[PDB]
Design a protein around this ligand. Structure first.
Ligand SMILES: [Mg+2]
Ligand SMILES: [Mg+2]
Ligand SMILES: [Mg+2]
Ligand SMILES: [Mg+2]
Ligand SMILES: [Mg+2]
Ligand SMILES: [Mg+2]
Ligand SMILES: [Mg+2]
Ligand SMILES: [Mg+2]
Ligand SMILES: [Mg+2]
Ligand SMILES: [Mg+2]
Ligand SMILES: [Mg+2]
Lengths: 51, 100, 267, 88, 55, 117
RNA sequence: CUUGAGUCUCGUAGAGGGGGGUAGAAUUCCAGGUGUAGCGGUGAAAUGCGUAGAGAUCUGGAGGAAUACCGGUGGCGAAGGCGGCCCCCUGGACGAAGACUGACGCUCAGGUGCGAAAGCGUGGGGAGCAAACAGGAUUAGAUACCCUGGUAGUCCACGCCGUAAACGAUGUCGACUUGGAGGUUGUGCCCUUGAGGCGUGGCUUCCGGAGCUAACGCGUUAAGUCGACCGCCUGGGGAGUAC
RNA sequence: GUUUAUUAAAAACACAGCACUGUGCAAACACGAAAGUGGACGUAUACGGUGUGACGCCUGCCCGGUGCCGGAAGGUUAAUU
């Protein structure tokens, strides 16, 4: 997760790495894992994803 | 005789021994009737992370072909070779000649 | 139980439980390199430590250290060794001279085993600490360059260095956790000594002990004059410790030179 | 599954003619001299079960092929085992 | 594409976090997404494609 | 006194709390303050409009020193892991870049089954 | 005899099983720089940790569990299963031209074997979760729900038990029977120029036709239309309990 | 098995096992003013010690009192100066 630039202008671009992790792989880890719920979350909350 | 794409990394400073090993490497493989197609020295490439602590290391590359009864010796030699670091030998995948 | 191939049950025939045997130690004809060895447990005077006083023993055979080097050897078959279970293994060097050695794990058909600096790193022959590798398994080490003493209890003992180490010392003892010891030392290296051996349970009072141990087990047993605690109705209020130790933690080891080591736990 | 040059051999050992691969004379010996080689395996990794599955089912049909063999001719049957040494 | 010495080939196949690249947003035959995914595994250990971009 | 000029910062932001610890390039500490370490507590804190008045607290204990410029670590998500960085630069601060240093297992240990509210 | 079972050939993808390596991340506990009154946590709070220096934070070591990303609506196996990577020993399954034997065949009470989790053994290791346990708080109250800690035990062989919503609450094997958007594998041919293009075998996911269905729904992977065999079912509680 | 030679052989001690703790070796510990010796020519799967007593099934709550294990910042604190 490496930023830094030239020409002092407190830009942005910290969001560029906001979409390759962040709270992303934290929600998975936050409280507990999944165990059987992934047995019904990628193979069940998938009915969410067919169109 | 199964082929083997074997690579490995030897400590930086110790890269002095680079040759003596290399010779005395084919000096057993040559001598079990074995075969060695591809083979080439890579170099003191600068490393991805502090492996063994020291982000620089020679590499090599082997791709040889011989009985596991001889690469077994060598297999553990590395472990009991000090000047060497992370070492690895990939099984056959078949004879590959030429590449880098 | 745990290991292969077998350590036998014992038919419940006559008030009993379990023995303990092994394949290959056939020959009992000890060599010639062994001395009588006396008996009791006195000293030029009275007693010291109670217990211990069984018969039949003898056998002293020999060896530690391995101050033959740059020379091969050939296990000529393991053997039973008393006053120390750990078996033994004969062992011949090329010149034609036998010794006894400790009996580490995978030995039998002569095998390699050659002492000396930079020699066969395997389970067999000793190789001075200095040039002893990641040392994850050592053996009967040596407090000093030429002693050879340490942890002779190869009856399942592990000593384990801490890789390749500096200053010239390292070590994590069997139990006494990490203590340092001169690197110019050595070690049987293999580190094992067959301990499917010490998982048994003699069985039956003397018939076990009494070829060895008397009955330490003496408790209060009343008469509160022969000891510090006992008497009364049939109970023993009163902060239990033998000859006024205080026999729970407390511990002693009050000095003498060393204490040149670090960690050793607590609990 | 097995060594190429040895399979072939066994079919030259047992081909009433040459190259009759899918016979029965052979397919026996094939499953047999396979098993006998699988043998020194499982007395090591003594619980690699799935591996042993097709090892059971191996012998399994090996007998279906002797039962057969024997059902349609004994002369051949007691000539195959005389050499294969089976009957266990 | 079946090895690693093409480590310049494999370089666009990651990110600023190492995070291996899907066969989702690059539906790449999938059976190629296998004979590429694995090479990064086997290669990462050999001091190339750094596991992460924090260390 | 040293007067660094190139030291770092570490923004650890738990949900119910967030600390700002200013350290040096190497790693040695330098100054600090934090959420509950400033007036409001309970859950009145945590909100971003609290965890930058903290930020501007580290400023008065990190100007006894010399910092002509700095970088930052955001170990931890939550309510004050951006806003914290806001009252940063502005209260009189430079900045090379941002680096995230938040936890990341490769599935290694079990986590708190915890909240079964 | 050859299309059924299969044997050889020759391809091929895959978390199939057992053993032996391993590298990276990650907590925690150790060891010191820094550094100061704070951290932790709830709805809030408290219990606990911090001036005997928490936590932050750095540089170091010990060690155990697990392999983000890839990962899939995916892949495998006879079910219970199984995820980095490497090495040896080893199953099965699929296909293409062929090459081979010649009904071997599909069913099976009892018979034998595999057996998620949990638990009992012997012995090992024990980083993190945590029954039981103690504080803490909520309530009338709390033997619970959240908070702070923690024993077993999750882990290892070796062995036992041998039950689960053991799942698709839907045996097996075999040929039928309108299709329509797919997933993954294997082989033919198309200016192979090509992302791709077209036929064709294993597996598979969703709709859904007739038809079956007591409705909901099954529907080429049938809950359609037939054919061999085995299992079980006969009203609720008493009871899978007693003897 | 042993025990109160000579009133008590028992439900006593013992016993295999089970637990605790101590002990890294010149061990702990025991006799000794001492040297030296037993623990043994043993070495943490080894030895002292203490509690319990083949076997199966179990081994709850209390750290306030006392042991001992740990901390040492502050208090008080000997010879001393
Ligand atoms: Mg009495
Ligand atoms: Mg009396
Ligand atoms: Mg399947
Ligand atoms: Mg269990
Ligand atoms: Mg809890
Ligand atoms: Mg439908
Ligand atoms: Mg009498
Ligand atoms: Mg008298
Ligand atoms: Mg009497
Ligand atoms: Mg008793
Ligand atoms: Mg008693």
């Amino acid at each position: 997760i490496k930023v830094r630039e030239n020409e002092p202008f407190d830009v942005a671009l910290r969001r560029f790495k906001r979409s390759c992790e962040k709270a992303g792989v934290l929600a998975e880890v936050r409280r507990r894992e999944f165990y059987e719920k992934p047995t019904t979350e990628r193979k069940r909350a998938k009915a969410s994803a067919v169109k | 005789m199964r082929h083997y794409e074997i690579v490995f990394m030897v400590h930086p400073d110790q890269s002095e021994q680079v040759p003596g090993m290399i010779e005395r490497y084919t000096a057993a493989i040559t001598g079990a009737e074995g075969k060695i197609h591809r083979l080439e020295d890579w170099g003191r490439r600068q490393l991805a992370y502090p492996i063994n602590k020291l982000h620089k290391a020679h590499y090599v590359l082997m791709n040889v072909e011989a009985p596991q009864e001889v690469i077994d010796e060598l297999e553990t030699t590395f472990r009991f070779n000090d000047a060497v670091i992370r070492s690895m030998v990939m099984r056959t995948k078949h004879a590959v000649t030429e590449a880098s | 139980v745990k290991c292969k191939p077998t350590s036998p049950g014992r038919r419940h025939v006559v008030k009993v439980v379990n023995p303990e045997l092994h394949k290959g130690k056939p020959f009992a004809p000890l060599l010639e390199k062994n001395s009588k060895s006396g008996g009791r447990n006195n000293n030029g005077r009275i007693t010291t430590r109670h217990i211990g006083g069984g018969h039949k023993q003898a056998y002293r055979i020999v060896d530690f250290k391995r101050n033959k080097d740059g020379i091969p050897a050939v296990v000529e078959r393991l053997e039973y060794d008393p006053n120390r279970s750990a078996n033994i293994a004969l062992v011949l060097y090329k010149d034609g001279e036998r010794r006894y050695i400790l009996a580490p794990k995978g030995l039998k058909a002569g095998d390699q085993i050659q002492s000396g600096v930079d020699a066969a790193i395997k389970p067999g022959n000793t190789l001075p600490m200095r040039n002893i590798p990641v040392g994850s398994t050592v053996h009967n080490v040596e407090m000093k360059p030429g002693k050879g003493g340490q942890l002779a209890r190869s009856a399942g003992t592990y000593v384990q260095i801490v890789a390749r180490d500096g200053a010239y010392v390292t070590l994590r003892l069997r139990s006494g956790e990490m203590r340092k010891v001169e690197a110019d030392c050595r070690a049987t290296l293999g580190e094992v000594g067959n301990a499917e051996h010490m998982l048994r349970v003699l069985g039956k009072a003397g018939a076990a002990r009494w070829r060895g141990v008397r009955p330490t087990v003496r408790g209060t047993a009343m008469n509160p004059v022969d000891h510090p605690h006992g008497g009364g109705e049939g109970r023993n209020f009163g902060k239990h410790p033998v000859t006024p130790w205080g026999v729970q933690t407390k511990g002693k080891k009050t000095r003498s030179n060393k204490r040149t080591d670090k960690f050793i736990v607590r609990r | 599954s097995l060594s190429t040059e040895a399979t072939a051999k066994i079919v030259s050992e047992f081909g009433r003619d040459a190259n009759d691969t899918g016979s029965t004379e052979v397919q026996v010996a094939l499953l047999t001299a396979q098993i006998n080689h699988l043998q020194g395996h499982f007395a090591e990794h003594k619980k690699d079960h799935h591996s042993r599955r097709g090892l059971l089912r191996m012998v399994s049909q090996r007998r279906k092929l002797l039962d057969y063999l024997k059902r349609k001719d004994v002369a051949r049957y007691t000539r195959l085992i005389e050499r294969l040494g089976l009957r266990r | 594409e079946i090895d690693y010495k093409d480590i310049a080939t494999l370089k666009n196949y990651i990110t600023e976090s190492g995070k291996i690249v899907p066969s989702r947003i690059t539906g790449t035959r999938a059976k190629y997404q296998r004979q590429l995914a694995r090479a990064i595994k086997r290669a990462r250990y050999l001091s190339l494609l750094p596991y992460t971009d924090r260390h | 006194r040293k007067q660094v000029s190139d030291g770092v910062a570490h923004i650890h932001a738990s949900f119910n709390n967030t600390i700002v610890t200013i350290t040096d390039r190497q790693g040695n500490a330098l100054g600090w303050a934090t959420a509950g370490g400033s007036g409001f507590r309970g859950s009145r804190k945590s909100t971003p409009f609290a965890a930058q008045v903290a930020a501007e607290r580290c400023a008065d204990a990190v100007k006894e020193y010399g910092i002509k410029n700095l970088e930052v670590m955001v170990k931890g998500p939550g309510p004050g892991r951006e806003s914290t960085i806001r009252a940063l630069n502005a209260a009189g601060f430079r900045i090379t870049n941002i680096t995230d240093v938040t936890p990341i297992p490769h599935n290694g240990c079990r986590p708190p089954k915890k909240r079964r509210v």
